[PDB]
Design a protein around this ligand. Structure first.
Ligand SMILES: [Mg+2]
Ligand SMILES: [Mg+2]
Ligand SMILES: [Mg+2]
Ligand SMILES: [Mg+2]
Ligand SMILES: [Zn+2]
Lengths: 289, 110, 153, 148, 166, 133, 246, 295
């Protein structure tokens, strides 16, 4: 035995740490943790984005169906009278619909203006991507939407989150004009398109066919695959560069292991030049008109 | 000659977990058609051989009782019998051992 | 370099080897079935086989008699060799002895063990290994071949 | 040491400052003692500075708890989900001020080795070198000893 | 001393919601303070890892090691525990998940030498641990095919990056 | 799968063992007596002797030793080598082996079928000889 | 160099220190059930008939000498005691006891059930999970008989009340791995049980407890187990031959 | 009827599944039957089992893995039972092995099973353009040097007999079939719903008709493994894995007045009995000759 409190206490902390390392505790709502004031949080959410919301509208936005049904479970199981004040809650359904519709419209217009040559199927693909489960959930989670959202099941399953994000968008669209909201969308959505490719989000499976069609439209005829560069054919690691020629002018060119893969690549490149989705392309404009 | 340094645990694990020091798996094990215990294919079954050993012991005991001493062993062939049996004409003129147990299934009359 | 050495070294020396086999043989002629160290039994088997051959030479042969006198230690057995064992081997030239490997000794020395026996003894029979029957699938397939060696001749 | 610890590439949370700048510090929680001497500085800070600080940074919520503790802490919490603990124990008003400022300007990313000072998507405008970029093409595209 | 392995059998799980996969039984069992060495025992314990329990019993049956019969007794006890106490149909349906040897508490004795010197000798003890799981034995891993190696090599070549480059 | 070890004898009955043995040995006699007549079959072209040429060899069996005498009176000791069953087995052409000389492969005395390996048994199967030691 | 192990644990029953006990063992209960009521063999077909069952039960209660002798001993030793109220209390005791087995709360279970019963209902089930619900009582609980054991040593009397009850219960037993073992959770299965209750009288704290559970000799075979089971043949040493009865 | 090769498979399998689920629904509960062990080995052992669920295999699983691997066929009372065929009533069980003294039952079972395998191999080894009609698996004794399957082929195909290449292809495919380990599944059916499964093969329908004709209740014995279904006499071995050496030896054209029928002959041995290379070659030589017993 050694006489003192200090080392004992300090060790109790270690015991706790190991206890948490060996069994991790299931994630808990930030709402159910020691420092919370819902109101102040909302106001902060507003101010930090440099936006102005109606507090009624935003408070409305972070409400979900499931939260209300769970609240009705707690209501009906204890025999309490809630219904008047509880069904006055006005969930986010409406706002979320306005928000998604508007965002899709807005984005679509953005792209349609930036890339005149993108076929409709393509711009549709892009908007589909920036409105995706993944991307929106990511963004919302990092803007502390998951924090404010009222729901059952704390990890907040992704569909509910998407709902909530666009809910907030709609709330903003009511609170300020389509102009301001357009700015918000181009700041927190369009930026997720940074560093991304085209065919990263488009997913089209036969580049050659699509190129032939898009060249019919342009009244150019028959891309001819022609082998340009090659190193080692007999190797386990060959390299081919396939060029695509139109009337003996070279439109585009690409690398690969196999002559097939390379040809396919040159197709993708040509496509990327035609649609004006390119590396060299003008970076997006972030400015105040 | 005394070791110049302590052999580290990595070296040591390399030596004693080596394939050549591991017990090698025996592939010749099978089941005795008789008692359904286990045996190696080239060896008599232990269980069955225990049956035989016990019975042999009892027989020898009872044929030690027929011999009054150490040095008396018969000058004739011997034959062992069981409850409800009688010596054959071919088997008479022989030493006879009579056991109480009924003749065992594996043991034939011959 | 052991090349072409037929006899294995046992006991305290060559003489102790002979006496070990002496005892083993006497045990074998008395009880007609014994069990011992696989190596020693193997070593014994040859002697056990030749003893019957000296027995066949008959009581009156002097060589066979003092041979049996040396090898069979308990003297009372010497008649048994000549008047019991040697008669019941008549037709057969060499078939006198059955030797099988028993499971390893249960004592902590875990030796390799064998049981050795004079054929035609009166004891519960050893559970010898049986060949498969003829009704077994493979053997049947061979029966086919056999009958077609008969049909084609 | 560098081989000893983790590391990360230089990044921002949510492409901050691209479209618009979003202060990443979300909330700030102080815990101090009205009575204990160790918290003395922290108390002064709560009197004079906190108020003003809160106006300078409208987007961060600031919770202050007087409770009976021996070691005053400030818990920063970021949009990133990151939580950073700090001890304001036995410091001036000035030192706490400086500290809280550091907390206000941080990304909330993990502070560890950063592999390289820059981060670029599309470094490559106008091409990226490959073994053929500077090589002349020949007529017919023949190999060195190839005949036609 | 520390006895933990024994308490592993006393865990109770929450009942299974229908539609979820049926959870395989786990039986922890051990024997403490055996007069075998720890290492000698390790070989035996290693031998029977991942074998179906009948296979393990077969292999042990013919080993000449002193430890072999100990482990065999432990396995039989574990089998009967598995069928009786926990609920397992098909006592042949168990395989050996974990098998290992720990060291026990040693006795210390004198070992005499000569010229009046002595060494200090340890009468050695050990523990044997086993954990049986209900099911067929998990399949033994085949070594990498040429195809697999080549894949991995290519993938590695493909993971390369321009270094210190920007 | 734990597949157990097996030998040729294992599953045969007491009836079939003599049979199998007869089968193999008889086919051995047939096969050896069949190739007994080389020159009437399809012999490869015989060439005359060139100066730098080298013959095939044999595989024999060392029997023992014997004395033998020479007309000058001296005594020599000799080794008896018996050729038992000797056949050429395969032929590797000049360019495929040393780049200098062709390689003939020659077999020694006959052995049991049962104790060789599947590969080897196939090799002799397509030949029509019994296996060489 | 000389040190030995300790702690070889042993349980030695010896009568001498067992007799020298200075404070002899105080029992709250008696291990047996004195007189086992043996029910009608047609008790299944009289249960669908209301005024057959009720009539014959009440009749057999009022007609018996021993029954009302004991009911008199209990009434005289313990005032404010009624036979017509009791099957209610008994039923409630039942429901709470098994609802204790659900939650695995042994403290309350020691208030409800007797010392003879507790080992039985708790023992085997402790490493398993039990879900047991009460849905219906088809025939209202009947009081079959009453008995008293007079111990002349202690002057102690134990009232033992046999209540026959017909019931609708749902029982599911889960294995320690959480996998279902005995029976479904959705089937309201019909049960008939003869439940013996006991109370210590001379005791001032006088609890009414659940003593035992009697099963009739004709009782319907209990529902089948889920898993398959094997019953080994006699284990034989080598020299012992097998013998088959017919 | 216009149907793809895959559609036939789908139909038959879905019918089989329907029937099997019907037989399953017929048994309302978990019912306990008491099986006794009449074996020479572990006497007096008594299994307590689920009626129409538990199988003699599942019965061996209570004993030891040794029975599971060694036991090909299960004698229930006096009759051979397939290892995976669910027990019906309470009874007594004995297990049957290849190296057993009077294996003949087991032998028959093995021969049948291999035959069926070959049937499956053949049916799916021909181009979609042609039409392959499996006929039956004529039951030969095993002293006859092979096992065999009868198949009729498309009329434009009547001229050619296979080449060592082709036979070796069949064999390769059968080994492919063995490699993946498929249990043999059994079902007892009524003729009405048996005929609906086969349909397009006439000879099959005839066979079913005769087979159901000799049984009072019109019961037909179905076996299936993987996607393949067939009718057969008597029980089969439990696994595909049991076969080791397997060969499709040769085919022989045999013609009736009303049809031209190809007889596919092959030869095989189980892992337990596997024979040395030389022995194998001799037996394989005998398996090339025509094997005739239809009666
Ligand atoms: Mg020595
Ligand atoms: Mg001294
Ligand atoms: Mg030391
Ligand atoms: Mg030491
Ligand atoms: Zn045996």
């Amino acid at each position: 035995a050694k006489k003192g409190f200090r080392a004992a206490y300090r060790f109790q902390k270690e015991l706790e740490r190991w206890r948490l390392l060996r069994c991790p505790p299931p994630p808990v709502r930030r709402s159910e943790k020691p420092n919370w004031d819902y109101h102040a949080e909302i106001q902060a959410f507003g101010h930090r984005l440099q936006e102005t919301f109606s507090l009624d509208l935003l408070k409305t936005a972070f409400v979900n169906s499931c939260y209300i049904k769970s609240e009705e479970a707690k209501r009906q199981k204890l025999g309490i009278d809630k219904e008047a004040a509880l069904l006055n809650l006005k969930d986010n359904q409406e706002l979320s619909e306005q928000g998604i519709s508007f965002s899709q419209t807005c984005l679509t217009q953005f792209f349609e203006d930036a890339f005149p040559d993108l076929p409709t199927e393509g711009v549709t693909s892009l908007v589909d991507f920036l409105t995706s489960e993944e991307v929106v959930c990511h963004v919302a989670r990092n803007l502390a939407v998951e924090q404010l959202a009222l729901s059952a099941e704390f990890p907040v399953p992704p569909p509910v989150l998407r709902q909530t994000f666009f809910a907030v968008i709609g709330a903003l669209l009511q609170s300020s004009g389509p102009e301001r909201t357009a700015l918000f969308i181009r700041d927190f959505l369009i930026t997720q398109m940074t560093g991304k490719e085209l065919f990263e989000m488009w997913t089209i499976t036969n580049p050659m066919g699509l190129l032939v069609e898009e060249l019919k439209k342009r009244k150019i005829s028959a891309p001819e695959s022609r082998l340009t560069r090659q190193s080692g054919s007999t190797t386990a690691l060959p390299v081919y560069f396939v060029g695509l020629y139109c009337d003996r002018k070279l439109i585009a060119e690409g690398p690969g292991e196999t002559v097939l893969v390379a040809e396919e690549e040159a197709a993708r490149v040509a496509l990327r030049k035609l649609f004006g989705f390119t590396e060299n392309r003008r970076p997006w404009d972030y400015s105040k008109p | 000659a005394a070791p110049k340094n302590r052999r580290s645990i990595e070296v040591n694990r390399c030596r004693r977990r080596n394939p050549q020091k591991l017990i090698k798996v025996k592939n010749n094990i099978d089941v005795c058609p008789e008692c359904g215990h286990l045996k190696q294919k080239h060896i008599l079954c232990g269980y069955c051989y225990e049956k035989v050993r016990k019975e042999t012991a009892e027989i020898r005991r009872q044929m030690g009782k027929q011999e009054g001493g150490p040095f008396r062993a018969p000058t004739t062939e011997t034959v062992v019998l069981y409850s409800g049996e009688t010596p054959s004409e071919q088997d008479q003129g022989k030493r006879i051992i009579e056991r109480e147990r009924k003749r065992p299934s594996w043991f034939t009359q011959n | 370099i052991s090349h072409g050495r037929v006899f294995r070294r046992l006991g305290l020396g060559p003489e102790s080897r002979i006496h070990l086999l002496q005892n083993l043989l006497t045990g074998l002629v008395r009880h007609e079935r014994i069990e011992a160290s696989w190596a020693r039994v193997d070593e014994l088997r040859g002697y056990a086989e030749k003893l019957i051959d000296y027995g066949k030479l008959g009581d009156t042969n002097e060589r066979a008699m003092r041979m049996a006198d040396f090898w069979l230690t308990e003297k009372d057995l010497i008649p048994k060799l000549f008047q019991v064992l040697a008669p019941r081997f008549q037709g057969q030239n060499g078939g006198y002895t059955r030797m099988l490997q028993i499971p390893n000794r249960n004592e902590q020395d875990r030796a390799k063990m064998a049981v050795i026996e004079y054929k035609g003894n009166c004891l519960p029979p050893l559970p010898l290994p049986r060949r498969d029957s003829n009704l077994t699938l493979l053997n049947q397939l061979l029966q086919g071949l056999r009958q077609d060696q008969e049909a084609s001749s | 040491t560098a081989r000893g610890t983790a590391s990360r590439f230089l990044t921002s949370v949510l492409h901050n400052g691209l479209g618009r700048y979003v202060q990443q510090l979300q909330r700030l929680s102080f815990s101090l003692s009205r009575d204990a001497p160790s918290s003395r500085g922290a108390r002064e800070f709560v009197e004079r500075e906190v108020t003003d600080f809160a106006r300078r940074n409208p987007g961060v919520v600031i919770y202050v708890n007087p409770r009976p503790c021996c070691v005053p802490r400030v818990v920063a919490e970021y949009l990133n989900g990151a939580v950073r603990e700090e001890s304001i124990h036995c410091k001036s008003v000035e030192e706490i001020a400086a500290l809280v400022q550091k907390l206000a300007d941080q990304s909330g990313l993990d502070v560890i080795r950063i592999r390289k000072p820059f981060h670029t998507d599309s470094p490559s405008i106008q091409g990226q070198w490959h073994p053929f970029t500077n090589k002349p093409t020949t007529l017919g595209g023949l190999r060195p000893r190839e005949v036609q | 001393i520390s006895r933990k392995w024994e308490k592993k059998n006393k865990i109770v799980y929450p009942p299974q919601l229908p539609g979820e996969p049926r959870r395989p039984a786990e039986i922890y069992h051990c024997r403490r303070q055996i007069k075998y060495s720890k290492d000698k025992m390790w070989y035996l314990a290693k031998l029977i890892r991942g074998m179906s329990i009948d296979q393990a019993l077969a292999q042990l049956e013919f080993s000449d090691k002193k430890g072999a019969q100990i482990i065999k007794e432990v396995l039989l006890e574990a089998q009967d525990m598995a069928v009786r106490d926990h609920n397992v149909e098909f006592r042949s349906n168990l395989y050996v998940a974990e098998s290992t040897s720990g060291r026990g508490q040693y006795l210390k004795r004198i070992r005499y030498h000569g010229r009046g010197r002595f060494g200090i000798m340890e009468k050695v003890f050990c523990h044997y641990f086993v954990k049986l799981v209900e099911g067929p034995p998990p399949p033994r891993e085949a070594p990498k095919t040429a195809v697999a190696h080549a894949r991995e090599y290519i993938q590695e070549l493909r993971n390369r990056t321009i270094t210190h480059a920007l | 799968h734990g597949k157990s070890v097996t030998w040729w004898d294992e599953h045969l009955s007491e009836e079939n063992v003599p049979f199998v043995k007869q089968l193999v040995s008889d086919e051995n006699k047939a096969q050896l007596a069949s190739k007994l007549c080389p020159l009437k079959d399809e012999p490869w072209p015989i060439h005359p002797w060139e100066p730098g040429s080298s013959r095939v060899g044999l595989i024999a069996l060392k029997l023992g030793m014997m004395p033998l005498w020479t007309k000058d009176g001296q005594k020599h000791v000799v080794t008896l080598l018996q050729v038992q069953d000797c056949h050429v087995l395969k032929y590797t052409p000049k360019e495929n082996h040393n780049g200098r000389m062709a390689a003939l492969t020659v077999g020694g005395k006959t052995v049991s079928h049962f104790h060789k390996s599947a590969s080897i048994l196939e090799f002799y199967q397509e030949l029509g000889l019994p296996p060489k030691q | 160099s000389e040190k030995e192990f300790v702690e070889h644990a042993r349980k030695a029953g010896l009568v001498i220190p067992h007799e020298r006990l200075e404070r002899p063992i105080h029992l709250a209960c008696t291990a047996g059930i004195f007189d086992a009521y043996v029910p009608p063999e047609g008790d299944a077909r009289i249960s669908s008939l209301s005024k057959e069952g009720l009539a014959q039960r009440a009749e057999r209660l009022k007609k018996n000498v021993a029954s009302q002798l004991s009911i008199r001993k209990i009434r005289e030793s313990d005032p404010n005691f009624k036979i017509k109220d009791f099957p209610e209390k008994a039923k409630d005791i039942f429901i709470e006891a098994h609802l204790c087995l659900n939650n695995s709360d042994h403290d309350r279970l020691h208030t409800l059930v007797t010392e003879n019963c507790f080992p039985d209902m708790v023992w085997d089930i402790r490493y398993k999970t039990v879900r047991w619900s009460f849905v219906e009582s088809l025939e209202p609980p009947q009081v079959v008989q009453v008995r008293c054991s007079s111990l002349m040593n202690q002057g102690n009397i134990y009232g033992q009340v046999t209540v026959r009850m017909h019931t609708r219960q749902t029982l599911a037993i889960y294995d320690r791995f959480g996998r279902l073992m005995y029976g479904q959770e959705d089937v309201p299965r019909d049960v008939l049980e003869y439940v013996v209750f006991e109370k210590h009288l001379v005791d001032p704290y006088g609890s009414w407890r659940m003593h035992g559970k009697i099963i009739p000799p004709w009782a319907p075979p209990k529902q089948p187990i889920l898993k398959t089971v094997m019953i080994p043949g006699p284990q034989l040493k080598p020299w012992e031959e097998f013998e088959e009865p017919q | 009827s216009q149907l793809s090769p895959t559609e036939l498979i789908e139909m038959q399998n879905d019918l089989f599944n329907k029937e099997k689920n019907r037989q399953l629904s017929l048994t309302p509960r978990t019912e306990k039957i008491e099986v006794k062990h009449v074996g020479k080995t572990d006497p007096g052992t008594v299994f307590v089992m689920n009626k129409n669920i538990s199988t003699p295999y599942s019965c061996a699983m209570h004993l030891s893995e040794w029975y599971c691997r060694k036991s090909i066929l299960a004698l229930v009372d006096g009759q051979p039972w397939d290892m995976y065929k669910p027990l019906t009533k309470s009874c007594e069980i004995k297990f049957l092995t290849f190296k057993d003294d009077d294996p003949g039952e087991v032998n028959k079972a093995y021969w049948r099973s291999c035959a069926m395998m070959m049937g499956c191999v053949i049916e799916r080894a021909f181009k979609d353009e042609y039409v392959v009609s499996l006929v039956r698996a004529p039951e030969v004794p095993v002293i006859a040097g092979a096992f065999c399957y009868d198949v009729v082929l498309d009329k434009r195909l009547d001229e050619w007999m296979p080449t060592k290449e082709n036979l070796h292809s069949f064999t390769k495919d059968a080994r492919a079939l063995i490699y993946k380990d498929l249990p043999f599944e059994t079902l007892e059916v009524e003729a009405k719903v048996a005929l609906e499964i086969f349909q397009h093969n006439k000879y099959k329908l005839d066979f079913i008709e005769e087979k159901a004709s000799q049984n009072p209740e019109r019961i037909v014995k179905l076996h299936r493994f993987g996607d393949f279904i067939d009718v057969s006499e008597g029980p089969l071995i439990p696994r595909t894995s049991i076969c080791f050496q397997y060969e499709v030896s040769a085919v022989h054209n045999l013609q009736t007045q009303s049809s031209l029928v190809r007889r596919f002959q092959g030869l095989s041995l189980p892992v337990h009995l596997r024979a040395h290379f030389t022995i194998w070659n001799k037996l394989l030589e005998r398996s090339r000759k025509m094997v005739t017993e239809d009666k």
